[PDB]
RNA sequence: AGUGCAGAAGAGGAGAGUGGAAUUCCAUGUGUAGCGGUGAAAUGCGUAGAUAUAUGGAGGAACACCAGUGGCGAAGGCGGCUCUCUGGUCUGUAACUGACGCUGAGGCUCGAAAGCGUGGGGAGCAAACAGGAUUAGAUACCCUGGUAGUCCACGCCGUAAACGAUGAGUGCUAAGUGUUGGAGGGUUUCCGCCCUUCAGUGCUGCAGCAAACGCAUUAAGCACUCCGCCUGGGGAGUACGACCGCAAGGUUGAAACUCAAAGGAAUUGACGGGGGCCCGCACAAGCGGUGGAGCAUGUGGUUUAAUUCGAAGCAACGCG
RNA sequence: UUUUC
């Protein structure tokens, strides 16, 4: 906060598939505190990323986040009177962090009345490098670098 | 018309405006923008992103009439002349030299009431 | 301490001799200070007259912009 | 105290001529919907071509860097450059004059800015004045305009926070450290160190003073000479009288009557639309919300033949 | 760098 930095709330990997970063996918779903469900859906999702085209879903996982998760950011600062940006650098946690934000944002209206083969074909297409989200990251470093003219002297 | 192929651009900027304008080898004037030219209002031209948008709406005209090299002329000691320079190297021109003259006087006249706010 | 340009025996300063005056003015074209050539208080002031007289011939611009 | 002999520095003064940059206006080429302005706008200027932009032309004023706790002058003040006339200062020496000195009531001279007369000039700047804004009002701050004046010559007035708020002349009393111009001894290529010695110019400090503040070899210390001035705050630098000025005004200068204070410095606390640091779900990162709908409530309002009474920013409004 | 306490 003030002082300076902080803990960083360590976590435990599944029961099944042994993953902090299923985990986290998880502990991103649950609402409300219903962690049932979303286990329910998560398991569910993986199975049926099992059955068509796919062998190893902890990979086809990581293959979806590796393109979709980004390598640069802006950040709408302000200096001496007016607000402007400028092309940041990120931690490797908040890349993630951001992956699973474009992701679960996109993974909420796709149009299907199945509640995880949206999840499913999210990260499939996203290890297929289609739909938004990995053209979302693709945007994210459009715009980045074009700010990189009014930012760099500062 | 005629592939000019080269020129020298102008830019003036004040504390409330910055004003953009292309010329010829000597030169004739080709187009201008300004900040207030593009729809903008009092004291939102002290941006430098409307300097940004300004001089890149100023090279749009000035390179379909043939031009790829240009100097840069600046006037007007301001805020936003260095992102009227910075995104006028974006859009496609060849910024080759920059000449910054604001003419000091050596003590001729004087300055106005020196304010009281 | 630090070395004044009259080392040499030179009295008057010649007037036009711009190998002896080229060291004080800058770049661009103004004087530079005695703290920064660092020298006596007599020939700043008898090189500022010098270049005074020698701006007005053409031996020497004012402006160096174009 | 002087004068001769020998050197040195300097924006000290008057007269005459000349240079570059900048702002404005004019002429011409390009160029078209804006320019300028402010916390925010608006008056204003632009389609009869502005701003911008390039070339020349005009004219008046001030002199970038050099520039410094530098320098010069009795003070006011003096910084582009060159030439003509010209004042003062400091250093070595003491062959020359043999006390020729200091201070100086009346008198005479000089005197920043503003102001007055007559004739010129007028680029910027801007009292008066006009218009646009803010405010409850704004004859003001802010903005757009705009004259007398600011400049030159020849006269006039003689004033200021003209201040170091510290009169002039002279002798004496620990040091330390920078700088401006000099003059001697040696190391010496010393012209680039150091030691000694004259003056001005800063700063820190001891005896000594002082109400503390502070001053302190450039005394507010120790002493002599000469000159000016003061005696509670108001009434007032006013009235009357006299002299000067074209005029504004200046110099000399009371009393009637009022109050028991008005004052200098130094502490404590408070305060400031003064400042420098630190903290806090105060910001920032995130999760879920309120303001849309409908419903339960507590207020404010309107209404009754009765709307029992309290609670008003945080610290009243599912409060008593 | 808007008035008011």
Same mark, same amino acid.
């Given at each position: 906060?003030?002082?300076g930095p902080?803990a960083?709330?360590?976590?435990?990997?599944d029961?099944?598939?042994?993953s902090?970063?299923?985990?986290?996918?998880?502990?991103?779903?649950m609402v409300?505190?219903?962690?049932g469900?979303?286990?329910?859906?998560?398991?569910?999702?993986?199975?049926i990323?099992?059955?068509?085209t796919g062998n190893?879903?902890l990979? %086809? /996982?990581?293959?979806?986040?590796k393109?979709?998760?980004?390598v640069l950011?802006?950040?709408?600062?302000r200096?001496?009177?007016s607000n402007?940006?400028?092309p940041v650098? %990120?931690?490797?946690?908040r890349?993630?962090?951001l992956?699973?934000?474009?992701?679960?944002?996109?993974?909420r209206?796709?149009?299907?009345h199945?509640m995880?083969?949206?999840?499913?074909?999210?990260?499939?297409?996203?290890?297929?490098?289609?739909?938004?989200?990995?053209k979302?990251?693709?945007?994210?470093?459009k715009?980045?670098?074009?700010?990189?003219? /009014?930012?760099?002297?500062? | 018309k005629?592939?000019?192929?080269?020129?020298?651009?102008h830019?003036?900027s004040? /504390?409330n405006?910055?004003?953009?304008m292309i010329?010829?080898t000597?030169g004739?004037?080709?187009?201008?923008?300004?900040?207030?030219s593009?729809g /903008?209002?009092?004291?939102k031209?002290?941006?430098?992103?409307?300097?940004?948008?300004?001089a890149?709406?100023?090279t749009?005209?000035?390179?379909?009439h043939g031009?790829k090299?240009?100097?840069?002329?600046?006037?007007?000691?301001?805020?936003?002349?260095?992102a009227?320079?910075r995104?006028?190297?974006?859009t496609?021109?060849?910024?080759?030299?920059?000449?910054?003259?604001?003419p000091?006087?050596?003590?001729?006249?004087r300055?106005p009431?020196?304010?009281?706010? | 301490?630090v070395?004044?340009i009259?080392?040499?025996?030179?009295?008057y300063?010649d007037?036009?001799?711009?190998?002896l005056?080229?060291?004080?003015?800058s770049?661009r074209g103004?004087?530079?200070p005695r703290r920064?050539?660092?020298?006596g208080?007599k020939?700043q002031?008898?090189?500022?007259?010098?270049?005074?007289?020698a701006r007005?011939?053409?031996?020497?611009?004012?402006?160096?912009?174009?």
């Open positions: 906060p003030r002082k902080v960083k709330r360590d976590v435990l990997p029961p099944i598939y042994n902090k970063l299923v985990t986290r996918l998880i502990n991103r779903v409300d505190g219903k962690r469900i979303a286990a329910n859906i998560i398991y569910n999702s993986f199975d990323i099992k059955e068509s190893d879903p990979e %086809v /996982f990581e293959q979806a986040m393109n979709v998760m980004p950011e802006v950040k709408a600062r200096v001496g009177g402007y940006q400028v650098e %990120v931690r490797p946690e890349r993630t962090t992956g699973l934000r474009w992701v679960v944002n996109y993974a209206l796709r149009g299907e199945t995880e083969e949206r999840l499913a074909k999210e990260i499939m297409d996203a290890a297929n490098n289609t739909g938004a989200s990995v979302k990251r693709e945007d994210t470093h715009m980045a670098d074009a700010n990189r003219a /009014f930012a760099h002297y500062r | 005629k592939n000019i192929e080269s020129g020298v651009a830019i003036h004040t /504390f405006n910055t004003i953009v010329t010829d000597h004739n004037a080709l187009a201008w923008s300004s900040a207030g593009l /903008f209002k009092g004291s031209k002290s941006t430098p992103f409307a300097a940004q948008m300004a890149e709406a100023a749009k005209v000035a390179m379909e031009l090299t240009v100097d840069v002329t600046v006037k007007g000691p301001g805020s936003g002349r260095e009227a320079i995104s006028l190297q974006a496609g021109l060849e910024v080759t030299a920059i000449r910054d003259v604001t000091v006087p050596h003590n001729g006249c300055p009431k020196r304010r009281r706010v | 301490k070395d004044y009259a080392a040499n025996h030179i009295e300063i007037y036009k001799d711009t190998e005056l080229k060291r004080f003015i770049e103004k004087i530079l920064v050539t660092g020298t208080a020939n002031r008898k090189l500022t007259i010098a270049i005074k007289r007005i011939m053409g031996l020497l611009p004012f402006v160096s912009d174009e």
